[PDB]
Design a protein around this ligand. Structure first.
Ligand SMILES: NC(=[NH2+])NCCC[C@@H](N)C(=O)O
Lengths: 338, 350
């Protein structure tokens, strides 16, 4: 019943969070500057105490779907037009929301990015792009973004996905679903626990969703995982509280495993119907527990006039150390630079 | 006066991260611990542990900044915070057994250890160790002088990664010194890859070793039927050990997992047996010491270092060395299969 933990900020709590984000913007260049990220875990504890208490309850809730912090200050006039592409979305006016997303995120763990997503940016942008209407990436609009575990293919996938809504004039819903092990039966659960599935990287990790100047070798890891997926489970951990890892568009049973293929089909139908809506208004930030829920986004008509929906996105890990083989050096936060 | 610095050991330039508390920092930390002891039942009660990660951020800001640098330093051996307040008169005598060591007078030091530890991660304990207490006690016990346990004295505690056999082994081992009149040391060693043949290093990265559960996990006449399922898992890990690596992760910053008394090569892998004994001689030769005076707290990065303890002469007169001890995980969620419920912190309790 607390699977969605909703914190509505008081005026003072919103004001204090804004002032802390603005102090960070005054000190540091980028919301993912190395010097800022080294300090971020400590700066995050200058957020309001009552908010930190509720975030800490969310962090240790192993059945959390989403923490939702409502009512951060967003100055729509100062923010200016929604950029027409993520590459142009590192705007002066939006920096403060980047810094604030990292401060909230750093209460839950350490922020990471992907060498193969939005040019290795840690703070990324979710906005509609002309020509991506019908794609299965974050910049889509007309076609529903299919539910998925974020970076489901990767052993380094985030523990939390952070989404800070700057603008959402048409109240477009984020979609969310967890797995009730009781409502699929221990038969299917036992199959979903088996290493009997292939989970391929999604299209956001491909050269078609990154700058052309990026090195071909960044993508070798991704292409290997498309061509030759490892046999993996969808469920793991305790039977009473199993972790979920599946992507509606990029998951298959291994060849000739009709029982695995059947279990996958049951899961898709179970998650598809159970899929429920969370609307992030301007100033609302959600942390999805990526171990527990799949997420997507409802279809919407983008106006492409500078007024469109705009989220900042971040990946959070409970354990930065575990991915050191995949990072350039100790402090580097970009997965797949090694 | 507050100070902090990097103390090298061999070529490990940030081996030891030392923080010296100012008198005001020491007082702030003591007042926070005392306030926690007024508001919460125990240093490891559910009420306190649900809040511990937020309460830890009431510790002095300058100290939190230095602990945070330690937390993300993937070459750290030991974080040492020196100069916490200990009232020796009020503490009273060193108990004769851990079973008598969860004292009202020492609770405030349990609280403070959990507060420092919760800056680094989430505190955990072990079903088979001191009845699954999260805050444990390190003191010499009469009759254990010559054993390979924390309560030993006369015989060196031989060095190991803490709970080396276990995928749920801690990221940090924390120690809060209450008294140490004879300046008895914890022994510490990490691998310097530049002092070992690259071929030996390559072998240690292979899944070519068995790391068996140590004595603190093995069933005895008195280990109890309650942990029947744990001891079955332990028997499996003794009789049919998984093939595991000793080194893992990035070549530039490998994690170490080895136990000087419970590690062997896979049957017939003579090259692995050679690489293992080369590593044991290297770590044995690189061992150095951390001595914690009263109010000194250390966090050993269990991913990077083995640890043990020097031989010492216990008096068993109530004046002996006494530490509070804790285990810290960077990722509590990963061990849910081995814990009784979401908030429970005891590994092997279900
Ligand atoms: N649609 C789907 N089933 N999976 C891929 C979604 C890509 C999205 N996380 C992104 O843009 O990062």
């Amino acid at each position: 019943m607390t699977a969605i933990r909703e914190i509505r900020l008081s005026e003072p709590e919103s004001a204090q969070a804004a002032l802390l984000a603005l102090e960070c913007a005054q000190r540091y260049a980028e919301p993912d500057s190395a010097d800022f990220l080294a300090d971020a875990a400590v700066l995050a504890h200058d957020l309001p105490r009552a908010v930190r208490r509720e975030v800490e309850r969310a962090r240790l809730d192993d059945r959390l779907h989403a923490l939702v912090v409502r009512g951060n200050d967003v100055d729509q006039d100062a923010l200016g037009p929604t950029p027409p592409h993520w590459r142009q979305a590192r705007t002066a006016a939006s920096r403060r929301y980047g810094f604030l997303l990292v401060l909230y995120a750093s209460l839950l763990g350490d922020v990471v990015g992907w060498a193969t997503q939005q040019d290795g940016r840690v703070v990324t942008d979710v906005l509609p792009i002309e020509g991506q209407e019908d794609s299965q990436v974050g910049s889509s609009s007309s076609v529903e973004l299919g539910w998925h575990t974020e970076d489901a293919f990767s052993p380094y996938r985030a523990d939390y996905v952070g989404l800070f809504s700057l603008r959402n004039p048409d109240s477009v819903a984020t979609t969310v679903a967890g797995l009730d092990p009781d409502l699929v039966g221990p038969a299917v659960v036992d199959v979903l626990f088996g290493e009997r599935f292939h989970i391929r990287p999604d299209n956001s990790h491909l050269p078609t969703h990154n700058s052309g100047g990026r090195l071909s070798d960044y993508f070798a890891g991704i292409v290997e995982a498309v061509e030759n997926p490892r046999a993996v489970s969808i469920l793991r951990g305790h039977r009473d509280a199993p972790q979920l890892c599946v992507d509606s568009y990029f998951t298959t049973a291994v060849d000739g495993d009709a029982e695995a293929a059947g279990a996958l089909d049951t899961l898709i139908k179970h998650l598809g119907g159970a899929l429920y809506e969370v609307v992030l208004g301007p100033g609302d930030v959600a942390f999805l527990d990526n171990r527990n829920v799949v997420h997507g986004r409802r279809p919407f008509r983008a106006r492409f006039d500078g007024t469109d929906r705009w989220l900042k996105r971040i990946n959070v890990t409970a354990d930065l150390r575990k991915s050191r083989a995949a990072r350039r050096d100790a402090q580097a936060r970009v997965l797949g630079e090694a």
